[model samples]
Target chain A: SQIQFTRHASDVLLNLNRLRSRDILTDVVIVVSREQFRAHKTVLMACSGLFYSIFTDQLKRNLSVINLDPEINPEGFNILLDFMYTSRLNLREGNIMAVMATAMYLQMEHVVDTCRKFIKAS
Target chain B: QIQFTRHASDVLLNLNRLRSRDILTDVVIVVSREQFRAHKTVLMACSGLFYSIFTDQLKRNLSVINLDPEINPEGFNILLDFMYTSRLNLREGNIMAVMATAMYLQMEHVVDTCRKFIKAS
Candidate 1:
């Protein structure tokens, strides 16, 4: 016998448990405003050109902590990190400018476009 | 200015729609000589196996992909759908196959879903 079941995107959020457990899989730690963010070099390279250059070509090998641009907004950077992992962004009115600016600085064209669309609609 | 956007569901649905329409598909993958049209960006984002292959390759256009013989086209289709839709439908005929294929593709969500289904049944 067979049964039909419908699954949704929220169902995939359960997979975050797997992702969180694998934080140790990441090779580098990004330090933003004294807050540590662990991330995979491959994912960063795949998603953002800024990160690819920093991790792959610009920096030395076996490096751990990355002190990002001092002007970067920590809240916006954290949101970007979430996007890198989940490919989902929840934009807020208060945070839009800061997030958009940081995303532009990071060369995340998709995020920038999304932010622009959100603004235009608003 | 900010507007609310539907997160995963809408994105997954749109990707699934794109897959069905075969619009803007850049990669032609051959599984057991059967061709499947796909987007490299979506696949790479969802699957580690695809990310590794696409990134490691020096050539931009991968004309064909010969997957493992154990990977059936039907099972692969279900896996591909899950990758896009974030949905998995388990049934007697394909549950085991889909489970194995998801594990092979390293799709933790699919694997976890299969585990729960099996445990409940």
Candidate 2:
């Protein structure tokens, strides 16, 4: 339904991930437990509607470091960020409710749908 | 009758904007002390030399890289510009040096594009 520029865009996204890896241009920070992360809203906004809304509301107001809630721990949240960063993910297939809630809150259809698939099919 | 165009240019346009303003750039490459700030991810994706060298430099945690001994600052600016803008300003005088440097950088897009103008000319 939606089209993204693939060839050069893939390269662009790859390098953007590289930027994430090196912590460049990260205006927003997401801190989970002792794990700290730097992020660009460009990527977050591109990946999920949840963050898109989160960032959209800020509007002219500056962004800030995000602190994760205890129940919605990084266990499920960790690889979800990986998917956002790299468009890739795996391990701990369990995709538990907390993780589902996290992705649901983020409104990531692909991530949420994949979990639905895993829970029902395999 | 050659034409160039697209709508996806905005992303690079914005990133290049960020580069020029000293916002969000990660690496500073010094070509004979002519400092050029850039995004490593952009560099690595654009050229082979940058891909290899920059990747190798990552673990060292250094924010600066250098191109010493005064090779081609003017050509580099044009080259870097082309990478971000998807356009090249070719000239009879600068073409060879730019192409040569593009060859040095292993930026085939620029490398072949130079050959293009030369071929058509």
Candidate 3:
């Protein structure tokens, strides 16, 4: 027998755990489908310090919405996806602030809250 | 496309980069199965103070076994995975022994489990 479950951003856990055995420096390529983009709601990579929730199509259409230099690499996007799903990710000093900002924008309430706590503690 | 990536996060790099620059009481290293053995060796070369601090954390988190307070560091490596993962995946006897060590170290979370078991009893 097989069991199945689905929810909003359900694939978040699967994607997050995948990074556990992954190397951060080496870029990892992921093949995502159109449906995955639709279900999870691809937020815009722009707006820098703020988080926004928009559809995948809208995100692709409005690529120039944000103006961050170096323009958010694939690694940054993967980091964002990891935070949205797992609620836990390995953070280095260099990227902690940016990751925290993304977590805030995505409305990942718990992740953002934890980041606030970590910042205070650190 | 001739794509080359940088192999970052070596122990030497981290030690040199962060060493003597700040008050870093502990360093946590995540490793794959292949690197586990080498990582343990590196941890062994660290100062006794650091090892003691980590042992204390281990002693605090484990429950079920009653370990003598003054046991040597003979088999302490058993708790390594649990320390990082925060889960008990060891055998029953080993788990309790590690819990006892964690209790001896006065690790609040680990000691809490002992209290939980006592309450259950």
lDDT-sorted candidate list, best first: 1, 2, 3
A16-93 in candidate 1: lDDT tens per residue?
Answer: 324434552345788777677886554455456677567545444347778888778889998887775566676888
lDDT tens digits, residue span B9-80, model 1: 544565566567664466877777677887665666666677667656464357556778768778888877
RMSD of 1: 9.9
Query: DockQ scores for all the models shown?
Result: 0.13, 0.10, 0.01
Maximum-TM-score candidate: 2
Q: Tens-digit lDDT track for model 3 on B16-78?
A: 222233212133322221111212212222223223433453642222232343532322443
Worst 10 residues of 1 chain A by lDDT: A1-10
* Candidate 2 C-alpha lDDT tens digits along A22-121: 8655678876787766777655655667665666564621567766565566666776777665556563456556567788877777667667765786
User: TM-score ranking from best to worst?
Assistant: 2, 1, 3
Expressed as tens digits, the lDDT of each residue in B45-116 for candidate 2 is 688887777566453345888774445888888878876666677887788878888888887766777888
lDDT agreement with native, every candidate: 0.67, 0.66, 0.35
DockQ of 1: 0.13
**Which DockQ-derived CAPRI band holds candidate 2?**
incorrect
Docking class of 1: incorrect
**Candidate with more favorable, higher lDDT: 1 or 2:** 1
| Winner by DockQ | 1
Isolated chain B TM-score per model: 0.84, 0.84, 0.33
